[PDB]
Protein backbone atom coordinates (compact mmCIF):
# COMPACT_ATOMS: atom_id res chain seq x y z
CA UNK A 1 0.00 0.00 0.00
CA UNK A 2 1.12 3.32 -0.26
CA UNK A 3 1.98 5.27 2.01
CA UNK A 4 0.08 9.10 2.55
CA UNK A 5 2.03 10.43 5.48
CA UNK A 6 5.74 11.46 6.42
CA UNK A 7 6.34 11.73 10.07
CA UNK A 8 9.47 13.70 11.02
CA UNK A 9 9.61 15.44 14.38
CA UNK A 10 12.68 16.63 16.71
CA UNK A 11 12.45 18.45 19.69
CA UNK A 12 15.59 20.53 18.29
CA UNK A 13 18.63 18.79 19.78
CA UNK A 14 21.21 17.44 17.74
CA UNK A 15 21.57 16.72 14.22
CA UNK A 16 18.83 14.71 12.52
CA UNK A 17 18.91 14.18 9.00
CA UNK A 18 15.78 12.62 7.58
CA UNK A 19 15.59 12.20 4.03
CA UNK A 20 11.94 11.12 2.32
CA UNK A 21 12.99 8.86 -0.60
CA UNK A 22 10.40 7.40 -3.08
CA UNK A 23 7.56 5.21 -2.24
CA UNK A 24 7.58 4.27 1.55
CA UNK A 25 11.40 4.60 1.40
CA UNK A 26 13.21 6.72 4.28
CA UNK A 27 16.39 7.34 5.70
CA UNK A 28 17.96 8.76 9.33
CA UNK A 29 21.21 9.96 9.94
CA UNK A 30 21.43 11.39 13.40
CA UNK A 31 23.80 12.60 15.66
CA UNK A 32 24.06 13.28 19.62
CA UNK A 33 20.25 14.07 19.30
CA UNK A 34 17.51 14.86 22.14
CA UNK A 35 13.97 13.66 21.72
CA UNK A 36 13.26 12.59 17.81
CA UNK A 37 10.62 10.46 15.29
CA UNK A 38 10.72 10.17 11.45
CA UNK A 39 8.70 7.47 9.99
CA UNK A 40 6.45 6.85 6.82
CA UNK A 41 2.85 5.69 7.03
CA UNK A 42 -0.87 6.55 6.99
CA UNK A 43 -2.46 9.84 7.91
CA UNK A 44 -5.57 7.83 9.49
CA UNK A 45 -4.39 4.96 11.34
CA UNK A 46 -6.72 1.56 11.76
CA UNK A 47 -6.71 -1.41 13.88
CA UNK A 48 -7.16 -3.72 11.17
CA UNK A 49 -4.29 -2.61 8.95
CA UNK A 50 -1.31 -5.11 7.94
CA UNK A 51 2.05 -3.13 8.20
CA UNK A 52 4.87 -4.40 6.05
CA UNK A 53 8.40 -2.94 6.46
CA UNK A 54 12.68 -3.62 5.35
CA UNK A 55 14.85 -2.32 7.43
CA UNK A 56 17.79 -2.24 5.04
CA UNK A 57 19.94 -0.41 7.40
CA UNK A 58 19.46 -0.52 11.33
CA UNK A 59 22.66 0.84 13.08
CA UNK A 60 21.40 2.49 15.95
CA UNK A 61 25.01 3.55 18.52
CA UNK A 62 22.95 4.01 21.31
CA UNK A 63 19.30 4.31 22.29
CA UNK A 64 17.35 3.95 19.53
CA UNK A 65 13.71 2.21 18.38
CA UNK A 66 12.40 0.48 15.15
CA UNK A 67 8.92 0.43 15.59
CA UNK A 68 5.76 0.76 14.89
CA UNK A 69 4.43 4.37 15.85
CA UNK A 70 0.78 6.08 16.12
CA UNK A 71 -1.80 7.91 18.41
CA UNK A 72 -5.42 8.08 18.83
CA UNK A 73 -7.75 10.89 20.18
CA UNK A 74 -10.64 10.31 23.03
CA UNK A 75 -8.29 9.25 25.08
CA UNK A 76 -5.19 10.13 23.64
CA UNK A 77 -2.72 7.35 23.93
CA UNK A 78 0.36 6.82 22.16
CA UNK A 79 1.57 3.52 20.91
CA UNK A 80 3.94 1.00 20.51
CA UNK A 81 4.74 -2.29 18.79
CA UNK A 82 8.97 -2.45 19.04
CA UNK A 83 10.67 -5.29 16.47
CA UNK A 84 13.93 -3.42 17.38
CA UNK A 85 16.05 -1.29 19.56
CA UNK A 86 19.54 -0.22 20.22
CA UNK A 87 21.50 -0.84 23.18
CA UNK A 88 17.74 -0.12 25.38
CA UNK A 89 14.91 -2.03 25.18
CA UNK A 90 11.92 -0.66 26.53
CA UNK A 91 9.85 -1.88 29.22
CA UNK A 92 7.37 -0.74 31.69
CA UNK A 93 4.25 -2.34 33.77
CA UNK A 94 3.90 -6.01 32.47
CA UNK A 95 1.11 -7.24 31.40
CA UNK A 96 0.98 -10.41 29.44
CA UNK A 97 2.14 -11.51 26.35
CA UNK A 98 1.46 -11.74 22.34
CA UNK A 99 2.51 -14.09 19.61
CA UNK A 100 2.35 -12.36 16.01
CA UNK A 101 4.45 -12.73 12.95
CA UNK A 102 7.03 -15.00 14.33
CA UNK A 103 8.10 -13.41 16.98
CA UNK A 104 7.08 -13.01 20.83
CA UNK A 105 5.93 -9.86 22.56
CA UNK A 106 5.83 -8.93 25.87
CA UNK A 107 2.77 -5.57 26.83
CA UNK A 108 3.76 -2.79 28.41
CA UNK A 109 2.31 0.00 29.70
CA UNK A 110 3.74 3.66 30.30
CA UNK A 111 2.28 7.06 31.69
CA UNK A 112 4.55 10.06 30.29
CA UNK A 113 4.19 13.03 32.52
CA UNK A 114 4.63 16.49 31.47
CA UNK A 115 5.63 14.88 27.24
CA UNK A 116 4.87 16.90 24.16
CA UNK A 117 1.98 15.19 22.64
CA UNK A 118 0.73 15.22 19.12
CA UNK A 119 -1.27 18.23 19.76
CA UNK A 120 1.39 20.07 20.68
CA UNK A 121 2.50 21.40 24.43
CA UNK A 122 2.86 19.44 27.37
CA UNK A 123 0.16 16.84 28.57
CA UNK A 124 0.29 13.89 30.95
CA UNK A 125 -0.69 10.39 28.84
CA UNK A 126 -0.92 6.66 28.38
CA UNK A 127 1.60 4.71 26.27
CA UNK A 128 0.72 1.17 24.89
CA UNK A 129 2.98 -1.16 24.03
CA UNK A 130 4.05 -4.40 22.47
CA UNK A 131 7.86 -4.94 22.61
CA UNK A 132 9.72 -7.97 21.27
CA UNK A 133 11.20 -10.02 23.47
CA UNK A 134 14.21 -10.32 21.32
CA UNK A 135 15.24 -8.09 18.57
CA UNK A 136 14.03 -8.91 14.97
CA UNK A 137 16.78 -9.58 12.38
CA UNK A 138 16.82 -6.93 9.81
CA UNK A 139 17.13 -6.02 6.00
CA UNK A 140 14.11 -8.67 5.94
CA UNK A 141 10.37 -8.39 4.63
CA UNK A 142 8.68 -8.18 8.18
CA UNK A 143 5.03 -7.91 8.62
CA UNK A 144 3.30 -6.55 12.27
CA UNK A 145 0.04 -7.87 12.02
CA UNK A 146 -1.82 -4.78 14.47
CA UNK A 147 -4.62 -6.13 15.14
CA UNK A 148 -3.26 -9.42 16.97
CA UNK A 149 -1.59 -6.26 19.22
CA UNK A 150 -4.88 -4.43 19.26
CA UNK A 151 -7.10 -7.74 20.42
CA UNK A 152 -4.27 -8.51 22.68
CA UNK A 153 -4.32 -5.15 24.46
CA UNK A 154 -8.09 -5.50 24.45
CA UNK A 155 -7.84 -8.95 26.64
CA UNK A 156 -5.81 -6.21 29.39
CA UNK A 157 -7.82 -3.37 29.01
CA UNK A 158 -5.80 -1.25 27.28
CA UNK A 159 -8.34 0.10 24.64
CA UNK A 160 -7.63 2.91 22.16
CA UNK A 161 -9.43 5.72 21.68
CA UNK A 162 -11.99 6.58 19.23
CA UNK A 163 -9.99 9.10 16.95
CA UNK A 164 -7.50 7.72 14.78
CA UNK A 165 -4.49 9.90 14.47
CA UNK A 166 -1.16 9.09 12.12
CA UNK A 167 0.24 5.25 12.48
CA UNK A 168 3.79 4.90 11.35
CA UNK A 169 6.78 3.14 11.21
CA UNK A 170 9.01 4.47 12.71
CA UNK A 171 12.67 5.35 13.94
CA UNK A 172 13.09 6.81 17.31
CA UNK A 173 16.24 8.40 18.84
CA UNK A 174 16.78 9.11 22.10
CA UNK A 175 20.22 11.38 22.82
CA UNK A 176 22.06 8.94 20.31
CA UNK A 177 23.66 8.64 17.51
CA UNK A 178 22.93 6.27 14.61
CA UNK A 179 21.64 4.95 10.62
CA UNK A 180 18.44 3.89 9.36
CA UNK A 181 17.41 2.83 6.26
CA UNK A 182 13.65 1.94 6.09
CA UNK A 183 10.82 0.85 3.18
CA UNK A 184 7.14 0.77 4.19
CA UNK A 185 4.92 -0.42 2.47
Not at 62 to 78: A, D, F, H, Q
Not at 101 to 111: L, S
Not at 159 to 181: D, F, I, K, P, R
Amino acid sequence: ASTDYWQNWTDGGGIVNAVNGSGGNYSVNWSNTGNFVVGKGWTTGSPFRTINYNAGVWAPNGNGYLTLYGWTRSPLIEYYVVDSWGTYRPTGTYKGTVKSDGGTYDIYTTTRYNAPSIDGDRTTFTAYWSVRQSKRPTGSNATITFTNHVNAWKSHGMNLGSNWAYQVMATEGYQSSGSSNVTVW
